[PDB]
Structures are given as C-alpha cells and as structure tokens.
Protein: Androgen receptor
Amino acid sequence: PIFLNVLEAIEPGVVCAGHDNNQPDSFAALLSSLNELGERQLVHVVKWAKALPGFRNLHVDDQMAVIQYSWMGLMVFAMGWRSFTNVNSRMLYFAPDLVFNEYRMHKSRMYSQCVRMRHLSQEFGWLQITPQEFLCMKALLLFSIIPVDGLKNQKFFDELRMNYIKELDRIIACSCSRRFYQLTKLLDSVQPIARELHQLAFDLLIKSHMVSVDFPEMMAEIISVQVPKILSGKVKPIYFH
Ligand SMILES: C[C@]12CCC(=O)C[C@@H]1CC[C@@H]1[C@@H]2CC[C@]2(C)[C@@H](O)CC[C@@H]12
Structure:
C-alpha cells in the first residue's frame, strides 16, 4: 500500500481564512477573505504537489506550470470533501472560520457557482466516495490541465499521468468498470466548475480597485498571468469522456 501511504501522509491539514466573523457579510469582506484563503492554501498546494510520488520527474518549469493551472480545481475538490464531511453539504466549508450559508452565498455574488460547488460536494455522498478514492482522484486533478502546445517535457507528464490513472484503477480494484466510469465522470465535472471560478476570479481582479476587494501577491500574479491562458484557450483541461 505504498502509494496510499504517501498520499495520506502528505495530505494538508486545516487552513484558516483569517476572516473576522463579527463584521457584516459584505461582498468586499467575503471576497477578500476568500482571496486570502486562496493565498494561504496555495502555500500548502505547492508543498503537497512537490511531495507527490514521481512529481520531481517533471521538468522544473512543468512543475510550477502544472500547479499554477490546476490549483482552482484542486482547491474546489478539496473544499467539496470538507463540506461533505463537516456540514454535509447545504453549506460550503471553505475554512473553519469561513463557512458559507445561503446569505453569504448571495452577498458574495457567487450564488450560482456556490450551488454548483454544493452539488459537487453532495456527489461525495451520493457516490459513497472513500477517503482513498478521494485522495487518488485529487492527485489526478493535478495532472488534468496543460497547455495546448504541450509542456517542456510532455513525455514525462504523459507517463506520470498514466501512472496516476493506474493507481486510481488499483484503488477501485481493491462493478469495477461501473465504479471507474463513475469516478472519471466525477473528475470531469470539476473542470466546468473551476472554469466558472477562473472567470469570476479574473473579472474581479480587473475591477478590484473599485469594489474594494484586496488580492494577495501570488493570487494577483496567477490570476493575471496564468488564468488568462485558460480563459483564452491556450491551456485546456484533459477530459476522460
Ligand atoms: C479557491 C477558493 C479558496 C479556497 C477554497 O476552499 C475554494 C475557493 C473557491 C473560490 C475561489 C477561492 C479563492 C479566491 C477566489 C479565486 C475569488 O477571487 C473568486 C473565487 C474564489
């Protein structure tokens, strides 16, 4: 069980957003705390990804690119799991100090995206996703979005992605065919959600000075340098189906 030993050992712990929960639920306050949470989670996503089996086989530039394209999906998938295990998924458990109820979903001006994130969260229950299946699926999501012109060493990426798909198939095997279809459909469903959030993030960065929404340093860098490559079609998700 070497592969799952590693995935369990490197899984990040709790990350707080730093939100002041006794101020009013304003658009600016909620979105600023979400941006701060993103900046804080990015630290952990980088350390997690660098410790994955085989990740250092990738060329160093492909290592940062793959993190910088897939962070949205990774973070939404993990938040869906937190919500499913914590508030059972009529709320969104972004962080222990940033839990969205319906009021916050409206004041954030993200209600429709939050609905879709809630549906993602509920699928962990409907499909009875095990912790091992969650861990393998999440690792795969790191290897599920790349430039259309390819990475600096695409061949090493294709081998690594192959091997993570094989590990997912092994966890299922330890009926099988139905399960694999269900899980790969679930993985595919993350990308349209992440794309809606990529669009929201970009639009909000552009008009941030006017809606009093603060963007941390690495969030502002990634949203203005990398996210527009996704929105303009230069970087695309790899779908199973
Ligand atoms: C990844 C984050 C923060 C981490 C998390 O749990 C999921 C959540 C999804 C919405 C993102 C948010 C970071 C800040 C963003 C990108 C806002 O700018 C717009 C949508 C927000």
User: Anything to note?
Assistant: The first strand starts at residue 92 and ends at 95. The pocket of 5-alpha-dihydrotestosterone is lined by residues 31, 34-35, 37-38, 41, 75-76, 79, 94, 197, 200-201, 204 (CB under 6 Å). The chain has eleven helices and four strands.
